[PDB]
Write a protein that binds this DNA or RNA. Structure first.
Lengths: 97, 112, 94, 87, 328, 76, 99, 84, 109, 94, 76
DNA sequence: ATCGGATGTATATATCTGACACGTGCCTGGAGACTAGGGAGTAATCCCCTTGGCGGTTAAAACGCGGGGGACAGCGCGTACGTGCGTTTAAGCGGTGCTAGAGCTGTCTACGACCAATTGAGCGGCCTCGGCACCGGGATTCTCGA
DNA sequence: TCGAGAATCCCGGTGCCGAGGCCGCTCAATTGGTCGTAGACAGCTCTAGCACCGCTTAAACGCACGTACGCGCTGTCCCCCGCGTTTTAACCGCCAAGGGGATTACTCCCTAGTCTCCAGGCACGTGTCAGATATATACATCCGAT
């Protein structure tokens, strides 16, 4: 009697919903704390003019999103659907990192 | 010696041919620079930028706005195979991706 | 004050000769400001490593024509060489 | 000095719904359960090859800020150009 | 109301002042008390028969009323063992060596009661010869089991920090002496303060420590450089001292003699440096590489263990290869 | 002696001057008394655009006379 | 009665035997004929100084080995051992050359 | 002119088989012997077309040895050991 | 005009400091080249070619040939994974590959 | 006649200071002849695009030190800067 | 007069010469009579390495005397 | 295959307000005209390098063939992962002080470009020769048949 | 689970012909000059980053079931490996002929490096419209049940 969608067809609205938008996916302020705690290791003090953190976020998508468009192809390849931990470890390896 | 014939006017172009000729000597690309060369170089930047802006401006009249938003410049590069190999290693800011689902993930109509 | 210069005035003049009604937001001009200064890096940066393989010392109006047919692929090739050679023929008779 | 910067619990920023929000843009359908302890290991590597040059560029002019003009000059020599920031 | 920890041997018992000073949520003056009774019942078996009486189990550290009954029976049971050793039962010897688990029971109650801000002793910046990381207890317990130091050896740490690396290595085996210096004031103010408590706390268990000398001595001074030459086992903390420090540290290591050990973080050579002429900067012409144990409890900045590299200095490998190119 | 300083919005300020001091000194006093920047101001009297190294008497403007004030954008 | 081996052991000699030598494996003169006819539809007379046509043979084994090294990993990932036409195109695309 | 045609049978059926053994594979299916010639013809379209364009620019009429290294480099596969 | 002295000898190096100084003025890498620079560039080529040949001949000593063939280089460069990331695109001519069998391809009893 | 010059004489002098018995075939010298002229392309080619980002005009003995810590990875980094700085300190006192 | 041309493999050829002509001319005749290249040959007599622009009498080798033949790789 | 009931998504009117597109006085990098030099082009010779040719040899390539095992198709079975919901916890807007640090402006010693003299390391080119290529023994080392 | 049948490394001989070693050179390369343009640097200005408060709510956290979906296995057949015999071209020297390589002066036509005159692009401000917002209709879609 409550409306329950069959599993599978809820995500297929989100693929229609997120592939249209150009919003930054990750939250801004939790990512801004993360950048400083990696500069903490090998520099005494840095200041980080704020348009750089708006810039470094952009190359944490086109490395992540471009991975997930490629790690899906190997999961289809083995007649499966769910991506796996041993799919990334293949799809990173052929790229050469 | 009458008045002010710039080299863009003496060519029939739009990009500043005098400006490019400064931006070779002060980049240290060679020792002696040619004179007929930056006339030629100002055409190739013209023909390329006339090719891109025509493409997005076509799609911008179908999304029913009238400006050109950087999302629209994403949609007019990855959908033309003359150009996608030229900029295949570029990440446009605020870019977005192309609408793209694989085949088998579509809902199978087993008994519909 | 010290001034600083870009390409943003000229690219807007191109837009009237394709769609004479539209406009471009100021956020998107920074792409085209950073688009010509990437190709112009590659093209003239390719002629400079071409003057050595013939061991000359003058980048003339011909090694641009050699580098253009290398960097750009074959489809946009056969229109690009026409669009320059038509221009230079205007520039000699001037 | 006296401001305490031992904020080591900071990997939780790339959190469980956020990565689930990420891979939808690539278009996957069912995400397995063990990806969360691996993708967090991915991202901390790729930042560690971008800042570690971006500090080196901005150390060279002797000023104490990784400016926004120097992230672009570090992503270029790895092979990921980034327009849209005056580069 | 004050709480008193009596000594089991009858020499310098602990006087903790009132009220209890709070430092953080994990190590205070009260969290070291639950690990105090557990270690005197291991050495002396008769005390566990007396601690079960009149002592409840549900006590904690946020309640002083549940604390006074713990120290009521504890103040009663020490006067019962002093009247027993004077009779026919022989007391404990004052010269034995403890285990490696009771050595950490030293450096809890010496460290936490001496410093009011451990994160102020965490004042470190890279590219400087002053970065004192998270060199914990179990990084140091391995450095005695690998080689056995006798009484003509020496152990100098130019850069001991608080000297807790010296308070353990001068607690397992011995040398001629042991040392540790640090130049600036507050990274050495909580080093001589350690010397006010390790000279008290080791005698509380009844065990003898090996001789050491922690002070505020200059680490780049001229006179201590030939003391490194007088030192067999070198411990210098080259985790992240820096490239501008490592070679002037290698300007200290040069005057040394054969058979000496260098306990250090970095591989001084890539494990196969033979006699041929490729040494003008490093000190590894007269040594080979020996790995220490990889770590399991201390984490680095990235998430990998911090391994140190023993180097047994040999000029035997010098003289046995000048003449190899001449025979026959 | 006296000086009048006319502003272009129709106001004058009367000030205590010496003609022997430079006009850079009295425009410094204009900075201390009104806040107008030294780079931004320029004072003219009958088609005479003043220079800072010169004094008041060197351009022959007398007692109880007026200097007209106008502004230019500073730049660098 | 002449003893046939079990299949899949002749190959495991040749993996142990071709991975140790450094010789080039394509015939020289048929490979020269493939180069000239692709060179035929430009410039109509290309002389091909003989060191270069040998030099171009090194860049096929620089590429076919690097393709067959990774298309093997594509097949083993899906519990199969035989490589397939749907094993090259996956291994070529992630490399990023099929646009 | 000697009209060349049907020359793709240079890379023969055992030759792909021998190249695969360097990569460490064990069982080759039957359809690969068509697909490799499809890939290998694509790869030589790109190299020689760049190689001709340099030696067209120098206005000499022989493809030199350096006019392969100086075209292989810009693709991102340099090649040592040819007078480089 | 006193007794002559080469610029490499004051460095205690072997690579030509003089020849490199002729190269940076003829690559148009800048307008002016500093005096202290090509000393430093000649040092880093000394170290970085010592790491190859010390790692080359050790792999040649195990195979019992007193010369160094290009087979002995490819089996040495792809050993240190540090040196591998610098030359990740170089294919040595006459190079071959490393000895390599995947896990499934071993026979299973 | 016109002469032509390579690096092959100097690399052989390096080999005596590591294994003073071995030798190198003449086929393999062409690798090391083509190995230094690839790194030297990258390193000095990296300082030239570094003089612009500080907008100077003199490639000095410091921008080599910046470019070395960029191109080579971290393991060979911390020995390479020592091997030059030790050399320059000899060259000033000379 | 007479000349002897010794080869290093132990053979001599006896030839008709003029001492007034250059040795480049008689080495051209060596090319026409044996096929040895002009760039590749070099003829020596008692530590005297000959030059092509000079004649036979200019280096003082007499009648019935022998020139020794040895070869060098040509190059370019 | 026919539905009714429930989300959501586009189409819809109406409205504001930050950001475009024209306007303007303006300093400076364009252009014109000019001579004074050296690079590149035009011409012409000389010898290495490619090309087409031809017997002989034989290692290598097709080609029929005859078994086993690996791709693969089906299916039961139990589990990890999605839907959805009811408390929770920082992220997001905006306001307010402090200020270390970026960007100039001059005054400035130290420097490398530059020119022209007087040599030595590189360079060819010979070279005697000894690691490295070969065949016939020779072991271990192997595997598929019971 | 062992006894034969192969590829296999190892040992020795035995040839050749490519490296290491030798000179006598034409020349970059130091040495010893200095001239001018930088980069060094001391003030000094101030625009932009840091930190801190509170308020608001829209995004993150665990129960609570369930069902699809991965995963073993089993069975079937069938497409490819292993060797045989035949059989076509790669291959090595040897063959000889020509086009296009590099070099060699030899002009002579060009592009720096100048001076002065100024319209081009800036940095200005500046009233208005496409475009986001937001409440409402709408059809497009899934799914329980039949």
């Amino acid at each position: 009697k409550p409306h329950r969608y069959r599993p599978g067809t809820v995500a297929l609205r989100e693929i229609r919903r997120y592939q249209k938008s150009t919003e930054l996916l990750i939250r801004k302020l939790p990512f801004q704390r993360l950048v400083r705690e990696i500069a903490q290791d090998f520099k005494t003090d840095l200041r980080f003019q704020s348009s750089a953190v708006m810039a470094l976020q952009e190359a944490c998508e086109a490395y992540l999103v471009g991975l997930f468009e490629d790690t899906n192809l190997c999961a289809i390849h083995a007649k499966r659907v769910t991506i796996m931990p041993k799919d990334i470890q293949l799809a990173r390896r052929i790229r050469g990192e | 010696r009458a008045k002010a014939k710039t080299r863009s006017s003496r060519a029939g172009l739009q990009f500043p041919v005098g400006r490019v000729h400064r931006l070779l000597r002060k980049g240290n690309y060679s020792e002696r620079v040619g004179a007929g060369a930056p006339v030629y170089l100002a055409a190739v930047l013209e023909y390329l930028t006339a090719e891109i802006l025509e493409l997005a401006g076509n799609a911008a009249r179908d999304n029913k706005k009238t400006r050109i938003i950087p999302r629209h410049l994403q949609l007019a590069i990855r959908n033309d195979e003359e150009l996608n190999k030229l900029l295949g290693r570029v990440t446009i800011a605020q870019g977005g991706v192309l609408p793209n689902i694989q085949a088998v993930l579509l809902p199978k109509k087993t008994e519909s | 004050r010290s001034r600083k210069e870009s390409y943003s005035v000229y690219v807007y003049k191109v837009l009237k000769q394709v769609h004479p009604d539209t406009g471009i937001s100021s956020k998107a001009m920074g792409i085209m400001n950073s688009f010509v200064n990437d190709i112009f890096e590659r093209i003239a940066g390719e002629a400079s490593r071409l003057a050595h393989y013939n061991k000359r010392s003058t980048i003339t109006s011909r090694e641009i024509q050699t580098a253009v047919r290398l960097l750009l692929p074959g489809e946009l090739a056969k229109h690009a060489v026409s669009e320059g050679t038509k221009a230079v023929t205007k520039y000699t008779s001037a | 000095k006296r401001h305490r910067k031992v904020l080591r619990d900071n990997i939780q920023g790339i959190t469980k719904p956020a990565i689930r929000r990420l891979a939808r843009r690539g278009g996957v359908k069912r995400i397995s359960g063990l990806i969360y302890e691996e993708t967090r290991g991915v991202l901390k590597v790729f930042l560690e090859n971008v800042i570690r040059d971006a500090v080196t560029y901005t150390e060279h002019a002797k000023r104490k800020t990784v400016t926004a003009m120097d992230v672009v000059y570090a992503l270029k020599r790895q092979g990921r150009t980034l327009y849209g920031f005056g580069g | 109301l004050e709480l008193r920890l009596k000594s089991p041997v009858g020499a310098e018992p602990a006087v903790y002042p009132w009220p209890l000073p709070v430092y953080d949520k994990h190590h205070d003056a009260a969290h070291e008390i639950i690990e105090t009774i557990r270690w005197v019942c291991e050495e002396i078996p008769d005390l566990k028969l007396a601690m079960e009486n009149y002592v409840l189990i549900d006590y904690d550290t946020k309640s002083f009323e549940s604390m006074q009954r713990l120290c009521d029976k504890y103040n009663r049971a020490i006067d019962s063992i002093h009247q027993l050793w004077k009779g026919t039962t022989q007391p404990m010897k004052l010269n034995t060596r403890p285990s490696t688990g009771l050595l950490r029971h030293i450096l809890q109650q010496v460290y936490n009661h001496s410093v009011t801000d451990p994160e102020k002793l965490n004042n470190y910046e890279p590219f400087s010869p002053e970065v004192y990381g998270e060199t914990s207890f179990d990084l140091v317990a391995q450095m005695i089991d690998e080689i056995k130091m006798t009484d003509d050896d020496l152990f100098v740490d130019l850069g001991s920090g608080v000297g807790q690396v010296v308070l353990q290595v001068a607690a397992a085996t011995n040398c001629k002496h042991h040392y540790g210096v640090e130049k600036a004031d507050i990274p050495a103010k909580y080093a001589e303060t350690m010397d006010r408590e390790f000279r008290k706390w080791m005698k509380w268990y009844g065990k003898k420590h090996a001789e050491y000398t922690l002070e505020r001595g200059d680490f780049l001074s001229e006179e201590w450089r030939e003391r490194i030459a007088n030192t067999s086992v070198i411990f210098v903390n080259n985790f992240a001292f820096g490239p501008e420090v490592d070679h002037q540290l290698k300007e200290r290591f040069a005057n040394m003699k054969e058979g000496g050990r260098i306990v250090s973080s970095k591989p001084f050579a890539p494990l196969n440096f033979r006699i041929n002429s490729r040494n003008l900067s490093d000190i590894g012409t007269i040594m080979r590489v020996v790995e220490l144990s990889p770590l399991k409890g201390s984490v680095s900045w990235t998430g990998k263990p911090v391994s140190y590299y023993l180097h047994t200095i040999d000029r035997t490998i010098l003289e046995n290869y000048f003449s190899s190119l001449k025979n026959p | 002696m006296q000086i009048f300083v006319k502003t272009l919005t129709g106001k004058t300020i009367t000030l205590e001057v010496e003609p022997s001091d430079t006009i850079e000194n009295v425009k410094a006093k204009i900075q201390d008394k009104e806040g107008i920047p030294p780079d931004q101001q320029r004072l003219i009297f009958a088609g005479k655009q003043l220079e800072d190294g010169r004094t008041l008497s060197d351009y022959n403007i007398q007692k109880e006379s007026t200097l007209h004030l106008v502004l230019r954008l500073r730049g660098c």
